[PDB]
Amino acid sequence: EPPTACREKQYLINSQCCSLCQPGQKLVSDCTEFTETECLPCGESEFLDTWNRETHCHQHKYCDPNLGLRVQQKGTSETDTICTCEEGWHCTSEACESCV
Amino acid sequence: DIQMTQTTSSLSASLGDRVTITCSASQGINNYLNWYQQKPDGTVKLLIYYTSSLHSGVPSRFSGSGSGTDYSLTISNLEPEDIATYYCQQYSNLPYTFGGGTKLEIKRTVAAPSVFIFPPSDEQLKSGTASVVCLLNNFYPREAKVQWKVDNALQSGNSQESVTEQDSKDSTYSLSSTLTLSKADYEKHKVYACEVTHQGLSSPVTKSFNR
Amino acid sequence: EVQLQQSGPDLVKPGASVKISCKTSGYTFTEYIMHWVKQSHGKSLEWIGGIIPNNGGTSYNQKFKDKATMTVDKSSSTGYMELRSLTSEDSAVYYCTRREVYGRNYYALDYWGQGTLVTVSSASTKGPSVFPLAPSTAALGCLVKDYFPEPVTVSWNSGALTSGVHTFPAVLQSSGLYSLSSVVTVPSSSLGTQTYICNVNHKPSNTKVDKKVEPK
Numbered sequence: 001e002p003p004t005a006c007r008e009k010q011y012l013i014n015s016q017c018c019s020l021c022q023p024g025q026k027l028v029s030d031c032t033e034f035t036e037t038e039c040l041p042c043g044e045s046e047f048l049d050t051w052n053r054e055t056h057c058h059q060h061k062y063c064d065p066n067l068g069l070r071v072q073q074k075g076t077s078e079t080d081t082i083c084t085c086e087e088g089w090h091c092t093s094e095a096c097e098s099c100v
Numbered sequence: 101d102i103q104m105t106q107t108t109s110s111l112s113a114s115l116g117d118r119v120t121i122t123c124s125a126s127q128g129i130n131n132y133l134n135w136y137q138q139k140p141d142g143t144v145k146l147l148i149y150y151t152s153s154l155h156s157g158v159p160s161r162f163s164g165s166g167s168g169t170d171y172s173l174t175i176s177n178l179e180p181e182d183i184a185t186y187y188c189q190q191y192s193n194l195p196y197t198f199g200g201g202t203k204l205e206i207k208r209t210v211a212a213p214s215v216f217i218f219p220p221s222d223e224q225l226k227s228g229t230a231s232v233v234c235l236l237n238n239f240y241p242r243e244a245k246v247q248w249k250v251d252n253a254l255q256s257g258n259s260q261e262s263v264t265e266q267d268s269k270d271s272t273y274s275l276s277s278t279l280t281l282s283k284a285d286y287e288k289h290k291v292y293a294c295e296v297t298h299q300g301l302s303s304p305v306t307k308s309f310n311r
Numbered sequence: 312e313v314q315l316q317q318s319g320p321d322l323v324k325p326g327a328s329v330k331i332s333c334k335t336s337g338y339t340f341t342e343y344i345m346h347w348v349k350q351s352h353g354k355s356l357e358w359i360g361g362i363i364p365n366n367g368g369t370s371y372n373q374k375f376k377d378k379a380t381m382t383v384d385k386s387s388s389t390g391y392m393e394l395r396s397l398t399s400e401d402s403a404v405y406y407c408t409r410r411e412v413y414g415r416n417y418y419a420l421d422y423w424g425q426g427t428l429v430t431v432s433s434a435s436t437k438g439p440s441v442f443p444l445a446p447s448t449a450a451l452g453c454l455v456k457d458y459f460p461e462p463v464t465v466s467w468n469s470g471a472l473t474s475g476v477h478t479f480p481a482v483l484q485s486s487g488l489y490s491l492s493s494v495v496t497v498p499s500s501s502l503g504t505q506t507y508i509c510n511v512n513h514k515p516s517n518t519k520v521d522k523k524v525e526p527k
Contacts, residue, residue: 001342003413010414017414019150022130033344033363033410034370036132036191036418134419136356142426144356144406149419156421187356191418195372196346196358214496216450219527221442224456231442235450235494237477262479262491274477276492278454280484 009051020051024077027053042077049078068099102126102190106199112207115271118176121202123188128168132192135164135173138185138201140265147186148173180206181268206271212300213239213274217293217307220286230286232279234294234307238272241299246277249293249306255279313337315407317424319514322436322460323397330393331427333407340388341365343409346420347381347392351403359405362390363412394429402431430460430515437488438518439463441511444492445527449502452494453509453522457486464512465493472497472507502526 002015010019018031021039026048029038042048042057060075063083075081085091089099103126113119123133135148146155151171152164161179165172173186183206188199213236220230236244242263248255259279266273277294293308318332333345347359360371362381369381378401380393394401404426410418439458444451455463465478478493493509503526511520 001339001413003415006414010417015413019132019417025130031414033368033412034191034194034196034361036130039130132418136420142350142404144408144423146419146421146423149421150417153417155419189356189358189420194370195374198356198358200355214450216446216494218444218452221445221454224440224442224454227440231454231456233444233452233454233492235452235492237450237494237496260482260484262482264477264479274479274494276479276494278490278492 011053018053020053021048023048023050023052025052026057027055045075047075047077047080049080064097067097069097101195102129102193102197104188104190104197104199106186106188106202108202109200110203110205112205113178114207115178115180117178118174119178119204121173121186121204123166123171123173123199125169125171125190125192129190129192131167132190133164133166133171134189134191136187136189136198138187139268140183175204178206180271182206183266183268183271205266208240208271210300211238211240211270211272213237213244213296213298215294215296215305215307217309219292219309219311225283225286228283230281230283232281232286232292234277234279234296236275236277236296236298238267238270238274239298239300240272242273242275243299244275245297246275247295247297248277248279249291249295250289251291252293313422315409315422315424317405317407317427320428320430320460320462322430322432322515324433325398325431327397328393328395329397329429330391331405331429333390333392333424335388335390335409338409340385342413343411345381345383345390346408346410347379348406348408349375349403350406350426351400356406359392361410397431399431402429404428428460428462432460434459434487436460436516438513438516439490439511439520441509441520441522443522443524444494445524446502447527448496448499450494450496451502451507451524452492453511453524454490454492455511456490457484457488458490458513458516458518459488460515461489462514463489463491464514465491466510467493467495468506468508469510 006012006017018037025039031037045060046057048057060081063071072084073082085099092098131151148164185201185203216235218233261277263275295306316334323329341364344361346361349357359375407424408420437459439455475496481489481491507524
């Protein structure tokens with residue numbers, strides 16, 4: 001009875017079940033029959049917002065001086081940086097890249 | 101090897117208190133931790149796996165927090181049968197390693213011992229020896245002084261004591277002192293006596309017999 | 312239920328080997344890793360190693376690479392462990408436990424053996440002598456003297472009497488041997504109507520004894 005489907009905060013490789021990595025963490029090495037899934041911190045300016053078996057953390061969005069933009073909220077390992085424009089310019093949508 | 105430190109070897113608490121037992125790891129273990137419970141008789145049960153999940157039978161009272169390097173087992177509403185040694189174990193990296201242990205005892209009201217004294221069996225005397233055993237039954241706290249008195253004179257290290265583990269119902273101890281003498285010396289003397297001093301007797305208690 | 316039934320206690324000389332045996336049931340032997348754990352008297356748990364039934368594959372704590380050998384017999388649903396080159400550092404309790412291998416239980420070692428006490432000694436075994444502790448609310452018991460090695464198991468009325476019982480830890484006597492008493496409180500009046508017999512097994516010397524305890 002190798003399990004068909006695993007548990008909520010765990011994935012399946014081959015015959016065996018493994019914890020996911022936590023938000024703020026990337027997969028390094030899959031779980032063994034002895035040790036559990038080896039994860040790692042995202043570090044300075046990347047983020048990953050989810051229980052994940054991902055090999056790289058995503059890059060904090062670039063909040064771009066020369067498209068009318070600055071850092072609204074600093075990103076962190078769980079979150080992503082959030083972008084908002086400079087003043088008399090209102091943002092062209094929620095996601096906020098263009099500005100008049 | 102990841103060194104797991106349970107920083108408190110033992111501790112005692114009143115029934116219905118909350119106790120927290122701590123386990124830190126020589127380095128981070130990303131929550132990869134179980135908690136075990138060894139009762140006084142040496143049976144080991146799983147309590148909590150992956151930092152905080154209760155195993156099959158375990159009461160709601162029990163719960164595991166922690167992260168990174170520092171973890172906690174917490175028993176809220178302490179019950180008389182929680183007495184055990186609690187042990188944490190890591191599975192982040194081989195070899196699997198365990199904490200030193202944290203022994204949890206109950207703080208309870210003073211309780212005075214029933215005392216009893218037992219002459220040697222006829223049968224044992226036949227063999228050349230005389231064991232005289234005096235029993236202190238169901239008392240608290242564990243500290244008790246016992247003095248043996250042979251026709252009113254006080255013994256030097258010719259007797260040994262043993263004490264039970266805490267009762268998982270009445271949270272009490274019991275203790276046996278045993279005076280061992282060659283059949284010879286036991287014939288020599290007449291009055292055999294057990295004098296107990298204990299935090300729940302105002303004056304010392306004695307039991308005695310004759311032969 | 313699921314149970315793991317380790318072998319009874321073993322007394323073995325320095326230099327020798329000993330093999331102890333976990334025997335499983337209520338569960339599928341192949342779906343869980345057999346793990347072995349050591350506990351020296353009054354110390355922590357140490358992990359020795361684990362073995363997987365289908366691979367016959369193994370992980371061993373380095374502390375035990377030259378001590379320990381785990382094997383499996385898939386047919387009887389039984390794991391073995393074998394300690395070799397014995398010294399007295401090895402006198403201890405040895406527990407088996409299991410880890411569900413697919414991962415339903417994460418890395419929970421979830422049900423444990425009762426332990427096997429390995430005692431490592433030059434000395435011959437030796438069975439206990441057993442002497443009533445007579446009475447005149449009312450205490451009585453029975454004294455288990457001059458045995459080696461640990462341990463000894465003491466029931467009353469073949470298991471029926473349990474309420475009231477205490478069985479003290481063994482102490483070493485200057486003689487070299489263990490001794491221990493086992494008492495019970497019963498109510499004064501039952502002396503006369505009830506037979507009280509302490510049943511004393513000492514596995515390593517095939518010694519059993521059932522001593523009645525009458526009043527004086």
